[model samples]
Target: ARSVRHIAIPAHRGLITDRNGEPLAVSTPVTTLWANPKELMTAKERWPQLAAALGQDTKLFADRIEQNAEREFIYLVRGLTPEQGEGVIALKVPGVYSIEEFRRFYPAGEVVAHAVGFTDVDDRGREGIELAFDEWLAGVPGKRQVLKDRRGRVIKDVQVTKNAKPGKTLALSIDLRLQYLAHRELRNALLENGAKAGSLVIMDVKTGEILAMTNQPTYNPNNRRNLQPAAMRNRAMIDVFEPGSTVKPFSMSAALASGRWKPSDIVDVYPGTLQIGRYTIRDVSRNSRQLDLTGILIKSSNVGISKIAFDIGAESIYSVMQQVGLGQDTGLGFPGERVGNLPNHRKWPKAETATLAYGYGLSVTAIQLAHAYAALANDGKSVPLSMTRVDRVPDGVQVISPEVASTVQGMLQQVVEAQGGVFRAQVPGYHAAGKSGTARKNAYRSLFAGFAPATDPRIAMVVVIDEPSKAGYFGGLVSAPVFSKVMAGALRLMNVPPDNLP
Candidate 1:
């Protein structure tokens, strides 16, 4: 009579690649070392060397092996680097056995950590894209029923219980090259500002594919030693914040949508303050006695934009914001993904109207903010944001007239001009357009939201530096330069011909 035994076969998880088929996450072959505890116990003299070489306490190893004396097999180490595996095999420790298995490896490391996510020691998807498409990436394993001798040796060929099925490869929308640029710039910006936290997102307005998304306070997915929760949070999509003046363009878009405002239309924005009953709305500083809609954005005048918000009425503003995807989900179905606020009421309060005008009383995930800007960049067409490659582009919802959108885009350009706007946001050899947002409640979320190659509006981006302790904290100072560097590099990487140069 033979002892019936079962052998387990490991299934390989799929590879995760960037949009261009560059490896983001891959399953690499690894060796798992196991031992026949019964036979190993006979070679007791080699215990010390074996335990020492494996970096385990010899006493602990002996204790574990002794306790498992009743069992024939035990795992010495589940994963070993090739060099370690080679030496262990050469040790010629009589009763040792090894098996080949697949384990997850991240090529981009912390740079693409949050986006591509990570897997557990068992090669199971634990977070990010790995977990999002786990079913598709995790395949079925097979098993074999074998006839073994009483000594625990396989005596004959076995019957296959099932055939192993490999997982399908997952292609993400991330451009590895651009992803590196975003990660590098975001890290540099956060460190330079000495900020508490920050996030940056870039998207292609035409196809609605996310080009790159990154966060500060990152962790290497390949290593999890002493990792804190802060290093794992995908702040760009989970953490919410008032976008400050970043949404000013949206309000300006609403005004343009009302057909009551034009780029050249003027409002009395100076003395630089507005009073609604007991509450007063004021600019950070004075612009002039008056400013046109374009100048209102260029100077980031709180009073002017708020005045326009009040004039346009509340419902229309909320409608436009809703249309731009502020209060909606990004459809990535990411774990813990959150949306910002866009309050709707029958009667809007005086100060509430003012607050909504300049990016307050409303919160948005960094992704939503970038999505909103993409709407402005897409000639007012609101497309669904995708984290995977887009084969067929969707016919988008037009949030505003193409003419109004063009006018707003032009104003955004003026906002980046070396003239009166945020000059730090200017991209070299490119016509860049975007607005600065400094929200205070105001932990000072220094923010810059806009697009590059302004004539064609290729990519829309948003940068936020949260709670900067040192360095100047305005959006133009902390975030715009980050925008400039990342945008400059990203546009060039995409080979978008520069519209700002010869």
Candidate 2:
């Protein structure tokens, strides 16, 4: 005859580590005290003592036990501290027992919160990378049969029904040090500038691996005491914004690819304004009488780019945009990733076409911008961006001619070198190429998107500051500094050799 027995075993959850194998999320030993209501009700007078030990009111505990009298087991208290759990066990109350469990803890805390994410009470992934790779990170629970005496004490193991399978380890593409740097800089920027929100992304240009992607207004995944859902949102890939002048580079590339506009070809923007429909396009700060393709980007001239777009038309602009992965999901398969909005070229109005050229009518997420810039840095080859570590570099689709990409890279470099360039985005001892952007349509969004070591691009990044009410509001003033600081530190961390000393 087979006798009924009881047993419990803990399944160890896997560790989620960064690229360097530094643990970001780990499991810690915890104890959960449960009760068999059928056995517990026998000691009704002692219910108050056990409930008091668990910090529950005597009446509530009694009612709960009575309500579950038909059940085989119910949790009295879960996730107890070692000392507290031991103290409770010392009571030696009937029908009450402790089971071993594991609780997820994030050692790096908020530094990697939005990236690594956290687990639920059941040790299941809830958000971020945790949710993205829940299956791989969760272990199977083990089963065993235990011989219990009449007093309900475990005597000996009768059988091992199933062995616990520890969760599989996940190695992310994130460099912990780079993640810390990005998180620190972004947090500081948000606080100092009094910005509502912000996001920063650092990507490996050649491989399209996301080295660091951090968002401000973050929360500690460990405690999560008062975390708001908005704070948990991974804004880098999930939120979309008008890219502003950052789109000018792609527009310039299209114009140049058409052979109608050349680096040396100049356009006259006298009085610094152009009329298209009821709207008039003008430079934000400065506009000259004439500017070549490079000058338009350097000065961030809306009027100049609109004229060029009219010459190149919407089809060319839209083709180049699509090729660069704009207005599309990055395919990282990240949860809640918005594909962003891109207008159809065939239906775009004359004024909307001009605005699209300079990044007014279209919207893109921070990751999309970084991906596009990474492609530009990678010689017009657009590769899929990866959140997990890759063993081999994946081949990319050719989006533009190498010659056109090279020409645009040279022009972007001018944005950092020419008189009144994006001086804030420049890094010492390295050549940098990028554009500054500021949008006022739906509140203020300041952006600085670029890649470093221009001679041999290694990393491409984007920084966006939303509603900066304290510090200056322009992208060059608000977001560029954050980009510059993070990129400088990330480059050194990666040990990418400097291509330029001066």
Candidate 3:
């Protein structure tokens, strides 16, 4: 009897590696055992052996084969280890055969789980970069005409119909060493504070490449035994929050850009409160004195920044935020990326405008905040953020005047050096500059955003801890220290020279 048959030739899926050539995800061949239900039913005595190999009960195995007796083929086991599959094949039962398949293995496991993502049982991408580049990561299967014998084995090779093409390897911009450090510190912070969740992002300021991105409450992709759907998201890129006080730099930048306020300009907060249409803006410390631009940021003065913002007006402030890529997608091509909420300046009330100055009323993701800070670190030029490697530095768009950016950088430096500022964020040998934000909405959201080696910036990073159940909930207490440790390690790993020399 003549049989028309086509054999499938599987092409291995692409490998995903970190910037240093360490494999994050790789595909390995697996054997899947399938059976002809009708034939398997005849070999009832072998049911116990098959169940033992599958690690299932004999009764259940027999019931499964019996239920599918009307079908031609039924999968007895999928994604089986080579040894287990081989043991089943040696049973020599009728209608039982093994097929070669591929399974994805994640070497870094939960450390890079969110960034690299994991594939489904069928080797299809379901999240993160894997989902973003599924077509590029999936290979094309080839086909060949063949002659099969009565036992269903290939007897003769007739002709080649198509050639198998393997997928191209993907090289991500992530630095594994930084990723491990970030993950460890973030997890430790979350545990010590008894927080619900947290996220950390580190970016190369010059190229805008994400060196490391990790989140707490992580799950191991290697084993999904007790996995929760909640832990699978890339919160740093997808989730948004109101960045309290961290928005002060932008407001200050706008004021300086208006040619109105100088770094040494003075504002008086005698009573520590400002009233606009029944709304009261007050500093947390209630400092009643004359303060300059640097003092405003150092004290995180809501009243001082409000006066400066109202003077600069709404249009100038909103323009600066838009230029920094707020209220716009990061063009990451990621799934479910939130552009955040930045209200239109035209509809702003006087009170709302003032509130926006101190980082309320507007929302942003951790990565977006990092992007904005990176632009500030790059001397007012906005660099395009990337998830993959960049061969050459790309041209950047000017978002703020260089002099204004330098002045703002100096202002931020005072935040870490000042007595009441975020002194906890300071690194041993580098001048660190950053802003701390703590907003109390339905839950507490804390953040620290800044860059290292304040004199000559190379890396920009952000840390956000959500709903800390422990004692202190402010950004300085919960998020700043995480930034300090991770930045110290990342700067050393990148081998950037220390600007704050003894």
Candidate 4:
């Protein structure tokens, strides 16, 4: 007897593209091998050649053939090698078949793994950009209700539609070129520093476009069959760390913007640790003197920044930080977005407020801190961190004045050119500036957040080394040099001619 089956076919979705038409991720045709195990066993001799092509030994096939002799099951061979698939096709294995399935492929592999994201075995987005656009990526899958005839055939005369449309392709804001370079540099830096893991991100100075974002120790997207959960983490935006002295530029900018202090304003800094109730904060290099704002950041003086935060009051510091999107979700629409915890100003432990001033007693994602520094790079205007390109440039709220940004930029320069701070971050031919940070991982977590083309800012970047084991672990010494390597390439690619190229 024959019966009808209802099948609904949905329209395919559109593919997403980068602003430059590069495919961040796209669906590709794949042949999924499906089979009923029971049928396979009884038909072993009939399928011997196909079984061999499937990479199964005749004896192993005999076992599975016997095991599935009576039960319905699917074979497990996936992403079949060209030879294996072709060999199987030649045998024409009955009851063993393949269906054309759509699969997502990231052509750039690990280079763009953390940006375009990867999909699950069943075509579901698990993390990164894929998860961010799940709805679009996974349009409603249709269902086909069917009644088979005595011959085991679905009668297609009748059909009903439950859902329509395929998943849409997602285009991201990441520049593939920058993404590759960042990955290369971060990998080299991690190898050099003997750090367990690390990450780096670069964004446009004015538009907030995420030109590049990379997480080292990354894995290939193509062979994700054996991927570990940790290997899939997007450290740049998901992992949090106490951002060390790299935070000084934001506090410095806030101070200058308050009209209470000028760039030349002087303050006293002693090399010893400053006590905040029970906890005490110390600087990497000792400083003992009444130094100006520029000297304070250049030397990465903890005493200087903590004291200023103390004077600025907890409320002021918290308010300004929140305004710049620190200690909060970056709104980039990725999963695992943790708004790094910030202590409440009112209940903040006496030591907590001061500790946070120099990038401790507080935690933030690397990308969040990068956006805060971007505010200074783009003239004190803070905009939302974005992974997708917006049709028009969004208006930013003035977290600080241009003068304050300029003052802070000058102070950051000293970090590169003045003291033995982040001088390594200084690109040979470009005017680059940013503060160095070394927070405790167990003892401290380290970070370097800053921007380059300091005069006409082009790219703002951040480098973080978690628990470095090398001889020296200062941001200027360990992280800044890495920044110089990547920023140099990024600037050159962006067409920002180098004065020191000769």
Candidate 5:
């Protein structure tokens, strides 16, 4: 009982890989050097040699030993490779020891950092997908006992208490190629615009697979310990922002669903500005113009959209947005995944209805918006977003009618092409449909959300540009190009056929 001591059977941490088995995060087996200070102090004359072996300055390590002389155990160095730790022990100096431990590594670095997250110095998952499923990843640990001498050194083996169990492997839906592409584009846009932050996400419409998700100002997990939380935050899943005019397509779908409007029905806007309850709606320039439902969306006409919102009433607008999963959580169970916001009133503020129609009174996270748009691209069937790969068709709820979803998809094509001149989103040889939104939240929030190969949609994407001080602060100007580039590359990477060839 007097000399008995405990020992460890190092259970390995599992690998976190991309859907294709490319390692994103892995735990490398290594050794930590700990020492009995009381015994080590007796040989202070040879301290120089001890420090030199670890590649440490003798003075720096000697100072630590001087302070901890009264303590029994002290860590000499950590994260030493097997040979490094073994070399120091091979010196045969008294009181020196080594313990096997796991050190985490990130092969994709900051590109996949926010997705894979990092473990702490103690090898515990601390954030993102790693934090979300830490329990499942960390299997049962093992234990045992040993016999040691009074000099604080292991004398002989004592007993085995339990066995070590390693953590389980985590495979995420992220495609490493796409992750790098998105991060490159996002980083460029952030620097070009001198924006505060930005996020980009791509999802498979059929399977709800999160093909790639990245954010600017990200950190490399391998180099991160006590990380800067802001840089480590997964903006796509955690932060919420206004959808702005991006919600218009969903609003338009409501109008069509209500049977009170037709795609060709014309709206009379004889001055382009409208006065409703002391609130005035303005366009780029004031002019008397009569346009149809599709024309309103192509022009991004606030008056035209507001009128539809007003006529359809608040309840209808709310229902349409709710149906699309706005103001709802993506349920991916990511940390701080917001439920978003939808301010409802039993009675309208007169201005609230109009504001809500074009996207002022509601807000959502990037994942939520991406999921909703996937529903549109999936012919109005809303599917839950998945962090892991899903090869089969995903289960979905009918968020809206397929015909109406198809109709709005056509309108978005006009927003990208046609005489309306939304040229920023053209995907070279692909038929793309999308909507850009600019909302003022003290600063501009630029958003672009849509899908491509409109006739047979395969993927949905969203890009959010936060607070751009330069580079023309509108959604089409700041964020649409980012979507166009990422989507074009994505379509080609997946071998998607070109549907817009002449």
Candidate 6:
């Protein structure tokens, strides 16, 4: 988009690199041609090279020049390589000119575009981190020398040098290799299960660094002309959904942390549903009564979790949720990051507390829940999550004592060992603990969130599938399988030895 009196300079943008120093995004130089066709008066109308050499459609070029005779711009091409630019400049054709510009280059392209995000046409970060870190990525551009004639051709003589500073390098927490593996594994699961779309994210529990975050229908940033808005949104941190049964474990943890409940503590769950007030909660499993803390989770009993919430009280459970890092922005530096709303405890209705007990009514980002689970995986401490790697480990606040946290971790592992929610996810060697959440989509999308390898945990993850077209459309069936496959490959790629090769 250049014309007379306009200066296009080769001002570079910052490098968007992975945790291991691999480049995810960068800027490169290009040549653009502009002209004020009006400058070429009818005196040169007889000249054929004026139109042909400039690659202008003769009739259109003439029409534009005639229409904007007083205007200074006659457009050619916008993105030209240095060679093409130099050649066009050397041609010395009247009514044609060249200017230098820079364009963004995304190496991993669509595969990581959802996580890394992309810049707008003006090089501003719009959807993901590109939008999240726009100003930082696209630095201030300096001026360059330009000499325009009355007709708008740039003069080769005038030389100007204005030093434009390049953008700073953006170091991300994503590992490039790990990013690809997570993408492949998640895509396979979504396709295999015949679901619509899916999302996956892996995080380092201790550091809060996101190793890899991906979604289905990734776009190649290199050529993003055809990308859809949904394909570009960072579902991991922005999309909110109801957590379903996976919400049970956190309630159980809150109960145990109170020092009044144990894994063996029993609650009588009825065959179908129980009424706290006007609302009735049903068990997905039938006719199971007298469930202990472990049974509440294994059976995914909504009734059981509601009973625990009643015994623990809503305020205590809500406080525990805050300590777990829900309904917060995460401050990870990504743009448009939403802090899912947490309803106030003072305004809680009787049914509100029970609904929240099983991950209903309350909204949470999938990544936010993953961060909370990380606290349990990391010995009861809540560490801040990051989009980049941390050289020094961050000290975190202890929400629950190590004893109570370990009790939760131990109990969650049973969801795999005895409950049969994540049996396929059991890596032959290591012990893993995770919970699955399936939230129905309203105006947005459905969700499936979970993490794994409970004991001696190394890897933690979350997944969300949108409007899954399956018979049993729960997190365990829709999202859990994707989590299992993704975690398996991701662990191996991280060089984590399996605890036992199953």
Q: Pick the lDDT winner.
A: 3
Instruction: Give per-residue CA lDDT, model 5, range 352-449, as digits (tens).
Output: 99889898878788888898899999999987788987777567899889999999998898899888546798899999998988888867988999
Best by TM-score: 3
Q: Which ten residues in a row have the lowest lDDT in candidate 3?
A: 146-155
lDDT: worst 10-residue window of model 1: 148-157
- In angstroms, give how far residue 85 of model 6 lies from its true place: 3.8
TM-score for candidate 2, please give it. Answer: 0.94
List candidate 5 segments past 4 Å from native.
52-70, 392-394
lDDT of each: 0.86, 0.86, 0.88, 0.74, 0.86, 0.73
Report the lDDT of model 6 for residue 176: 88
Candidate 1 global TM-score: 0.92
Worst 10 residues of 4 by lDDT: 150-159
Once superposed on the true structure, which residue ranges of model 1 sit more than 4 Å away at CA? Answer: 1-5, 36-46, 71-74, 89-95, 148-157
* Candidate 6 C-alpha lDDT tens digits along 392-499: 877888986788888888877877667445565455566666766555553224334444456477667777777655566666666666666677777778787676
**lDDT of the structure predicted as candidate 5:** 0.86
Candidates ranked by TM-score: 3, 2, 5, 1, 6, 4
Poorly placed runs, candidate 6 (over 4 Å): 1-8, 42-56, 83-87, 145-161, 419-421, 442-452
Per-residue lDDT tens digits for candidate 4, residues 101-207, read: 56776778888887788877777778887778878777876766766554433434355547556776565778777788899988988888788778898988688
Better of 3 and 5 by TM-score: 3
Clashing pairs in model 5, backbone N/Cα/C closer than 3 A = none
Q: Identify the runs in model 2 with alpha carbons over 4 angstroms from their true place.
A: 1-10, 145-158
